Amino acid sequence: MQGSRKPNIIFIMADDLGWGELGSYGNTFNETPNLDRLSAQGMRFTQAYAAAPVASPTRASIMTGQYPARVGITDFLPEDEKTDRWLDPTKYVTLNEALSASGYHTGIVGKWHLDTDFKLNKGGPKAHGFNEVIGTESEYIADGDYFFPYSKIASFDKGTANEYLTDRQCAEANAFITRNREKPFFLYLSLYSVHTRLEAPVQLVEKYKQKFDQKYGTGKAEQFFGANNVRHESAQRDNPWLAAMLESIDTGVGGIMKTLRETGLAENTIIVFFSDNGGAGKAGNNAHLRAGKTWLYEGGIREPLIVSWPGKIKGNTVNDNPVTSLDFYPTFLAAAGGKPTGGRLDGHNLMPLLRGGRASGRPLFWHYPSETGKWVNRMSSAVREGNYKLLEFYNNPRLELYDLQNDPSESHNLATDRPAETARLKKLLEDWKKEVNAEAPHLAR
Amino acid sequence: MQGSRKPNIIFIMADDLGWGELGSYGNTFNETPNLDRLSAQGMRFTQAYAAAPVASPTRASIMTGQYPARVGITDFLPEDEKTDRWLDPTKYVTLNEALSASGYHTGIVGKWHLDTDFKLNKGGPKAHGFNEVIGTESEYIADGDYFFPYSKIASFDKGTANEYLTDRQCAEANAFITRNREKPFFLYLSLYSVHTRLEAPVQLVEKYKQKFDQKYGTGKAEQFFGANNVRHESAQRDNPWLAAMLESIDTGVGGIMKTLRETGLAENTIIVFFSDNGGAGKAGNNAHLRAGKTWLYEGGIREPLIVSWPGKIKGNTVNDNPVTSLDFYPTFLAAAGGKPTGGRLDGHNLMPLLRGGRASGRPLFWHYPSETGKWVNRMSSAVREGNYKLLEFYNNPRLELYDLQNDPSESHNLATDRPAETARLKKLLEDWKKEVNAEAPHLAR
Ligand SMILES: [Ca+2]
Ligand SMILES: [Ca+2]
Ligand SMILES: [Cl-]
Ligand SMILES: [Cl-]
Ligand code: NA
Ligand code: NA
Ligand code: NA
Ligand code: NA
Ligand code: NA
Ligand code: NA
């Protein structure tokens, strides 16, 4: 039946995918032709942030629209016996429920990581009200399992011989789109890829190993990524396993884009591609950015962000205004014609910015006390306002100030040379840490 | 040269050895004939405690004579990047320095676990003043390496093909005894065994596998401890790998006892055998005691304790008075004719008790906030006074009270039925936690 309907929202999030990985973000080794077509059909953000530098807190920021420091989940949820933390459906109106109240059918395909108690699982996605819960984790994901039968995903009881998980999750996405084509839907495609341990179909791995040898020389893939390298990790850039994993994601994104075109949903569907945190050490490519996952340096929090809404968002646009994972909740509620129902939202609606509007500066905040990883040298808090970023570190206590426009690699600390700017941002950070009751870092006495 | 000399002190400590493992503690599967001879030549303690339920804090209690909660090391030291904690030689007069000031030459053979920074290692045993430092760890021990070349022990640069670590450490003990026979010595024999991952010489493993099949039936060692069981762990009691590991320790203890007899040092040497914490889950045997390593239940803190001093300590005695790892510092200083030099000691000299004296009751305390393991259900504090033990748990907050004489397995909580005793011990525990500035547990908000 033809007639206007609220737009579908498809939120595709990769796990641990670095800012330097996509073709449109400058990578020449990986191949991401479908995501580069999505970029050509939409708006590419160069200064998009996860609200945390590890998995669970960024997922919490997306589902609650609140600072991870305010939620009290600032680090990943470990196995059940190592935490008492979980996201409680009675404490938050989650993004899926806000969209349900605005007329949407909701689904999650994949990773939740907001509850690691599987005995009761009172904070799993079904408990949060998702209408469809497809291949979510049934035990602690840990280093993962990417081939059927999926040891961490009991609910995928059926599958083909040696099926690859990214391919399964993308097929489930297309099927969800087809089953729900007559009504507004929200689909959270929460990929397990590219989380370690790296694993990809053999023929994709051999493709990128041959490409690596063409780039670096004969026998070099075997030299750096042979039998003896069990995790397929190294300090070497261009990771054939990551490239293979990313090709599977990219092909799956192409299948979703094709499904939208075939079902005649492409004109009335918003497609977002994002990542939950920065590239992982020894696996991921954060380009010139400093460090990666576990750090509040730019490499750990800067993420790929493509938003497409054909005919509403100008294609092949590049937006450098800073945005974060907190902004999806209000943006999607605006697209859905909904309004907050008393719940606090810590981000901002980007629909006016996506439509070509102007961006007012606002401060952005992070807090990483590393409650789970215990990474004492990474424990830090940060504020960005305009081009300046201030980090406070707790072990070796000190402030670091970067001008990210002139120093995007955070190689030249300005805190001593710009003491007034340092103090101005320090005051914003101190005030914010009070507002959110920021958890103290786990250090000695 | 003949003439009286202060007694030698040999402190032999197994890693993660359970109360239920030794022959003299009732085990009929393992074979510990040399340690059972040591028991027949000395005093066996049935109610001996580690001051903590994991490695580093108990080692801190021994070297400083202070409560782990007062030191601020109540959980194991993880890898360097996960901690800022270490034992500082400028904060404590350690037991080796107190004995050096009383005329002893000192040595450590083996595990330290009081500093995991190997870049500088300002808290390693050499920095603490040990005269000889033999085969201590040069990197984070983690799941260990028991065959030469020892991946965690660079300083054992020389060794025989496939040498086993327990055999090396016991040979180094005998050689240390022989080299220093003319003067008083303190030897800290800090074994890496029986820490997981379990590993023992093949012919010892096959001996205990055949013994397991005789006990349990044909093919049962292969059934429970075959190729498919990589860590050699199970819920099954009688672990052939643990039995093999313990035979190597026992044979080594016999070699030390023989070396003392041959060098004519046996009459003037105090030999202690102890363990740093309770048996490990799926590996160790804590007999009827509750739980094990990581818990403040009796299985995690009750340890084997044999003390021999021929002609001073009556042989084949059994002492049921409670004693802890805090008591070694004052006991050894009394044996050495030394006196504390301003340093606080939290235990008590047992020399009068070892000589046949009477034991006054005193309260004993534990604090386990699990700063490193993050084991939320194990987080607890405890006080024992007389036969009563009170535990306070922080997750699922509650008090548990046990009468350990009538309920040594801690199977019948009395806290509701004996409210006045519960309150009396609760007050001692609250006062103690204040005295030592007990670290709060790592829980949610
Ligand atoms: Ca992640
Ligand atoms: Ca231990
Ligand atoms: Cl537990
Ligand atoms: Cl680090
Ligand atoms: Na839990
Ligand atoms: Na809710
Ligand atoms: Na599998
Ligand atoms: Na460290
Ligand atoms: Na000292
Ligand atoms: Na080795």
Residue numbers in the entry:
A (entry chain A), B (entry chain A): 1 to 445
Quote the paper:
We expressed and characterized a putative sulfatase (PyuS) from the bacterium Pedobacter yulinensis. PyuS contains the (C/S)XPXR sulfatase motif, where the Cys or Ser is post-translationally converted into a formylglycine residue (FGly). The enzyme has sulfatase activity on aromatic sulfated substrates as well as phosphatase activity on some aromatic phosphates; however, PyuS did not have detectable activity on 17α-estradiol sulfate, cortisol 21-sulfate, or boldenone sulfate. The PyuS protein chain has an α/β sandwich fold comprised of 15 α-helices and 13 β-strands that form two anti-parallel β-sheets.
The crystal structure of PyuS shows that the active-site cysteine is converted to formyl-glycine. However, with no sulfate substrate bound in the active site, the expected 2-amino-3-oxopropanoic has been oxidized to a hemi-acetal functional group. In addition, the analysis of the electron density maps, B-factors, and geometry of the metal binding site allowed us to identify Ca2+ as being present in the active site. Our structural studies indicate that negatively charged entities such as malonate, bromine, and citrate are favored ligands for binding to the PyuS active site, and these ligands are in the vicinity of active site residues His195 and Lys293. This is not surprising as they mimic sulfate or the phosphate moieties of sulfatase or phosphatase substrates, respectively, and the active site of PyuS has an overall positive charge. The PDBePISA analysis of PyuS crystal structures revealed that PyuS forms homodimers. Dimers are also seen in the crystal structures, and PDBePISA shows that the interface area between monomers in the crystal structure exceeds the threshold to distinguish between real dimers and experimental artifacts.
